[PDB]
């Protein structure tokens, strides 16, 4: 398996520990990971789709052109990038007036999208193509902790195009993190938004934090020792949001936040420091204590 590795923005520029975690995690599962030189903002579908639908698709189709001219499919680590590029690839393949509009724009940069790129999410790629058995075989240190799984919205949905099964009651990420030896705990409104998407974090910050705090409460009330995500924006919102939540609401939880690649990382015998866990603004050390 050779995959063009779309980086996005948050993971490379703020949570690089996830990038290090992912490169090794998938290294051992047996995927050569290529770089897409010059890939930009995907661009974020919630914010830019809301600003100008044409701009979202044109700039998104361009990043896809990078991968097809490389002759390779994209894998991404973020629901935001996954949604934006997957929906872009799907819309251009399925709507020919949208495709004509885009290539008339990509013509001015010597580019043309022709429809070969497949967009894949690394968690879905792990489930469908690699196998969850190959995740358990590789656990160097089992993690017997209770984990509050946060799927994020742009992973499974829209189900009519993603074809990743149920968005109301999924098992895909729960089986992945349980293969590490952990227990996925049920909690109230599990599939609800973290609050950050759609430009809301930037425009209505506490509105987003009210929804993250709702999620955190339900997780700990279900006995979760940490949360796990498949999206850097969820990561920053759950992580940096807790600093903010404390400053503005007065709620303090010290609730550790992990991206799945980092949690799988520990399963593989990775060093805390190459995970840049110190970079988390809420200390994971209470978690490292229990593991």
């Amino acid at each position: 398996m050779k995959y063009a590795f779309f980086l996005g923005c948050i993971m490379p520029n703020r949570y690089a520990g996830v990038e290090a975690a992912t490169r090794t995690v998938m290294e051992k599962l047996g995927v050569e990971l290529v770089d897409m030189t010059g890939a930009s903002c995907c661009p974020a579908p919630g914010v830019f789709g809301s600003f100008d639908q044409k701009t979202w698709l044109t700039l998104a189709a361009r990043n896809l052109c990078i991968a097809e001219e490389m002759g390779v499919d994209i894998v991404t680590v973020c629901n935001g990038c996954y949604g934006s590029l997957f929906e872009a690839a799907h819309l251009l393949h399925d709507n020919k007036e949208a495709l004509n509009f885009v290539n008339e724009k990509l013509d001015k940069v010597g580019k043309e999208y022709k429809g070969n790129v497949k967009v894949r999410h690394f968690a879905e790629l792990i489930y469908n193509d690699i196998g969850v058995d190959k995740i358990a075989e590789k656990v160097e240190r089992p993690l017997n902790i209770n984990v509050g799984v946060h799927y994020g919205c742009h992973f499974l949905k829209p189900t009519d195009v993603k074809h990743l099964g149920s968005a109301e009651r999924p098992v895909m990420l729960d089986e992945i993190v349980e293969a590490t030896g952990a227990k996925s705990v049920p909690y109230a409104d599990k599939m609800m938004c973290c609050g950050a998407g759609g430009g809301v974090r930037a425009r209505e910050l506490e509105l987003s934090l009210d929804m993250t705090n709702e999620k955190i409460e339900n997780m700990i009330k279900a006995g979760a020792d940490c949360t796990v995500n498949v999206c850097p924006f969820c990561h920053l919102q759950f992580d940096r949001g807790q600093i903010e939540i404390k400053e503005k609401f007065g709620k303090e939880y010290n609730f550790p936040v992990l991206h799945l690649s980092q949690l799988l990382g520990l399963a593989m015998g990775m060093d805390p420091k190459d995970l840049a866990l110190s970079v988390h603004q809420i200390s994971v050390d209470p978690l490292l204590k229990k593991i």
């Binding site: 149920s166 109301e168 009651r169 049920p186 109230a188 409104d189």
Partner: protein, 652 residues
Amino acid sequence: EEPRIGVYVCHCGVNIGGTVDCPDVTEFAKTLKNVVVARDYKYMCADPGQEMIKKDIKEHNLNRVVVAACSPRLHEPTFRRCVAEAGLNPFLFEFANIREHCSWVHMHEKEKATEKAKDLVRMAVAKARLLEPLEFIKVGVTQRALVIGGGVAGIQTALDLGDMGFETILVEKTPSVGGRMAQLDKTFPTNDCSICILAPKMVDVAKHPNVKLYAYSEVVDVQGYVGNFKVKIMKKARYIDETKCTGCGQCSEVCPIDVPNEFDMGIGMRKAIYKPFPQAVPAKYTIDKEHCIECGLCAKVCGPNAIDFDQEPEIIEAEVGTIICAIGYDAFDPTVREEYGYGVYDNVVTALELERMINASGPTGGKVIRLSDGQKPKRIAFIQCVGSRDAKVGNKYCSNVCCMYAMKNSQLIKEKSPDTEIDIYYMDIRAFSKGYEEFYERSAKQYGIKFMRGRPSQVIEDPETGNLVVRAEDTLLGEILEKEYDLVVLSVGMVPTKSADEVQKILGISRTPDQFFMEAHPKLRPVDTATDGVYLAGACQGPKDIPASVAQGSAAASRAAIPLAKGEVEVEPIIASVDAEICGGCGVCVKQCPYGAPRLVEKDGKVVAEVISALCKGCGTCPAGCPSGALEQDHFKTIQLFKQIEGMFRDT
């Protein structure tokens, strides 16, 4: 004689004329070879239109008539009778479909729709030139009827037919007749005891001199045509002697297999040997061989030794003249709507499970109890339109009865427990028939039942208590509700019954977009099918309540009685025949027919093929596969279709 064709282009008021330039089509039709008369009129099927055709047939000595209008599936018989009254043979008439196939599907391209209608007229005129006079085939009608399905709708049809003096067979798949009406506790809007009013009908049909009831039986094969059907009924083995068995039920205790009691929608368990419900007709016990482990413990307790595993299914061969399908419906499975939690939460139930819980004969003795702790629920939420009016599950129709039955059982719960709070989450209250609106007002004013206008978005279970939170916008307030309930009832809609696929293939009938069976036309023939001699009655034709199914039951009895009373119908002579001078006895055609009509015979000291006109239905497959061209089906000859293909591009 050379063809003299009259072409008639209808406006259908504006349904055609509004899109297709009908005057311009008639002008174009006059330029065609053999067309001597061409007119456009607002309603060709109306009296002035039919008199117009017949007056032209006589005054202009027409030998062909083309009508460019609606589908022949609607009015082909109508115009065949029209032209036959003026002397013209019914099969020198050709139908061009410029409405369903043109005006109604090209409303935004009038110029092309008009051009298209001209082509469709020319293709019709092309085939018309080569049409030949055919004689309708008179066949005797067997003076017997078959009703498939023993619910209130099928029972009504058999009683009506039996009371008219027609022999009638009633085939019921389950052990007992009665249908879902036998599962209801009460019936809106009168709240009559459902079984208590239906049981006299079940009694009557079992005792009727002109009705033979085959319970625990299924139709497994239907052959022939209207008035000449030959059907096979498999009387499945109960493995109990109807003659030697009491119906007391002292063999269930000696059974180690517990089976989902389907009559109670699986809420209570039944034994391998069982009787569906106490009021069952016939009142005889049955053993489900599927779950039977054949350990024989029941046989040791059985006194009469009525138990015989050797019992074999017996096939009944019977000739009938008409068939009425009345196989009913099933309840929608609301598992697919995962946000509501059915099959996941203990205290979420369907409304048809509720009927069984409320019914005194039911598994709970008529007591509404939560399936998590068995306590009585004090707060109950009804959710409407579950599985209906919902594109996400593929059911874009209204199930017709759920609004009324949800208010009904809300009344019956209030009567057994006045202090129960009951909320109904709805979108439209559809209380549309006599006494229904009053029943709706009564539910709110007399029984204090609450109505929230807002389809719930999800149900959330409290894992501690098992209770349920329903979340919905009170759309009449603009605020989001989050009320807690002890039991949530999903007002599930109606879907076709499981075996509707099997029945559909046996009878050869179609289905509407809602997946129920397709009537010939909703207003012209509401209980006929396009298959002659096959009729519909009840919920198998579409969601509806009991008075509607009964009316269709009686309607289907009237319609099915017409051929029986006439004793003689006419079938289409669009049959295949072999030209013996061209047939060399290749043998290709004999295996192509599923009814074995083409056969190898020796003629004039040599081998030719020959088709039994009586076994040919007119599908036209064997003439299409014939290498020598000796086989041809009248009214659909290759040369006639050839001219029709040319007619699209050019006149002839």
